[PDB]
Assembly symmetry: D2
């Protein structure tokens, strides 16, 4: 493949913590500064939107995988709107399309995406303060999930992951 | 609606524990005995297979929602094979189609289905031996998830929910 | 497989003509009288509604594959409501799930299902008065599609197909 | 929306004719020269492959919407590989995601996409030499479908559509 790495950033919306939102915005910037593509589920609030705005601040390309049948809710920070009409079934597209999936914070939708990514043997990085989810996913994935300490650490982990792929 | 209640029994496939299989068979029997319809992921392994066999022993109707593009892997105990060709994206159809979701055991696919069902505000009953999953879903659902003690207790809970 | 044959009856919804509705009801009834399961797109309009009503008149089992995320539009004659939340992507589930697909009338959604059925290597029977779609699908399918003259003829064709 | 127009080029894969492939390549180039994004079904065959290669020759961005669960079959000329695992259900994503759908040749998957696009009242342009398909879609769309004469005429039609829609 000559394609740029695609990094999926998943996380909560309205219930994202202040730390999740700061982490998301920083991640978006850092992904774009590497020349990587950012993929999100296209939500116009919370982690996905802060990540997308971060990437755009650093002139990166952003892809949104929308659950709706139209673009009515997509933000200006999404360059490419993939309109699925699949509702929450689109979560599987997010994970299959990503070279690495980062869960920035935790919530029900994020839990579903992490679970699907690990079932598909996709590399997953958790960036959150939820020890229960970390232990549960480590157990179910036979310790294949990665736990990051910061946005910068996520980028370091991605570089090690995509180097082993190569 | 004059339709019969559809109870979705989710749970591990190949990695199901022996207790998950015994619980799944008993759930299938008891669901069928109520005249309810059983929905599973449809394959010839694990909770899907055992629940479907339990329901068939009691002459219940069984629906399988298959992830592949044909019926190669279908349980012999599935009456209606819905072939989706969606892979793991069929998990959402399982949840949306169920009046109640029971998670019998734990694994990655089941975690995805429970999360989706709770996000849809579907009633969800956990029947497992995994205290981490029970505490995590109680927290994320603001204690709306039910934790069952047995297959019989799942049935009792469903009767309270659907009445 | 010990499962009953599943016959997918596709056709227009809101745009169905009175002829399509009569044909649909008769098809549903005959599918059920054969001891087969009827699958439709499940909604309370058009061929879906009338085929389902016909199958229920003969006490057959009916499956509806709904495009929305709830049962609000389901036919009262659907026994099993499979709620997909997929929109028109559910058309692929309709054809993958069917042993034979019947197109009862014509419209854009029905054309998409016929095309997907033929691409997914499923037997298709056309029961309509649309010569252009009949010729086009005969050409694209190297004459594997079947053209029926009546609801009874559809059942005759199914019996020949599911025998081999 | 400040997003670039996304033009979906649909058409036969394995069964594409030499004319379909020439038209597809030229379409891809012309879409990219307008600064538009090309969307295809993403695979390394037929119209998908040749449209993607034409767009890359003109340094355009290409999106591929793949039906399988990995990138095994992806065209080398796809920049963004959307892996769906949906099989032919991805055809709905192709049409929902496109501002205009061009059907470059005819085959069964293409017919499904044309039909779904028209059902959604998405603009559709047919570029083919099949008068049966042109008459059928004109009838079923109440003459809303467009019939193009050449790849260049497709671009002219897209400009007329983007202006009114
Ligand atoms: Cl979430
Ligand atoms: Cl499964
Ligand atoms: Cl399967
Ligand atoms: Cl599981
Ligand atoms: Cl419909
Ligand atoms: Cl519906
Ligand atoms: Cl139709
Ligand atoms: Cl394809
Ligand atoms: Cl593919
Ligand atoms: Cl085609």
């Amino acid at each position: 493949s000559m394609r740029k790495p695609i990094i999926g950033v998943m996380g909560p919306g309205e219930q994202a913590t202040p730390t999740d939102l700061k982490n998301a915005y920083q991640l978006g910037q850092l992904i774009a500064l590497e020349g990587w593509v950012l993929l999100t589920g296209g939500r116009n609030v919370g982690v996905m939107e802060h990540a997308s705005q971060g990437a755009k601040k650093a002139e990166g390309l952003t892809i949104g995988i929308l659950p709706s049948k139209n673009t009515h809710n997509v933000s200006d920070a999404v360059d490419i709107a993939i309109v699925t009409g699949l509702g929450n079934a689109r979560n599987n597209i997010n994970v299959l399309s990503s070279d690495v999936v980062i869960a920035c914070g935790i919530g029900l939708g994020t839990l579903s995406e992490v679970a699907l990514a690990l079932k598909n043997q996709k590399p997953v990085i958790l960036l959150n303060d939820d020890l229960l989810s970390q232990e549960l996913f480590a157990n179910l994935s036979n310790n294949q999930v990665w736990i990051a300490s910061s946005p910068e650490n996520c980028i370091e982990l991605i570089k090690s992951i995509i180097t082993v792929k190569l």
